[PDB]
Amino acid sequence: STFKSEYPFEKRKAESERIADRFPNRIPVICEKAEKSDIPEIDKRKYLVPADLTVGQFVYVIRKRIMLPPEKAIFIFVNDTLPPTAALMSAIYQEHKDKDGFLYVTYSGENTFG
C-alpha cells in the first residue's frame, strides 16, 4: 500500500511543513516501486534529498539502496512523465510537487513510454 493511502492529508502536509521548518534545504520525497515491474523492492520510501541534486544523482542513491547491479535498467517516473537524469530535483519538485508538499516518484525496470 502507498504512503498516500496510509496517512491522511493533514498528517502528510503536517510532515512536509515540519521538514520545511527544520530542513529548508531538503526536498521531501516519497520513492516507491512501480506496479508492473519485477525490479527489486525498496526497504524505505521516505527521503530527504539535498536540494541541489540532479535526478541522476538521486537515481544513483536509489540504485544503491535496492542493490541494483550496474548493468540493470531503472526509470524514475514523476506525474506520468520521465524526467531526464540531467534535470534538477529542485525543478522537478517545483513542477510536480503534490498538494501535500511531498514529491512523489515511482521507479521501474520498464520504460512505459517505449
Binding site: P8, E10, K11, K13, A14, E15, E17, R18, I19, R26, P28, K44, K46, Y47, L48, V49, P50, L53, Q57, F58, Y60, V61, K64, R65
Partner: peptide, 22 residues
Amino acid sequence: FENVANAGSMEQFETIDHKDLN
C-alpha cells in the same frame, strides 16, 4: 485517520548526504 494530525515522523525519513554520491 481519526484525530488531529501531528507532524511526527514515526516512519523516519532517510537522509541522503552528498557523500553518499562518492
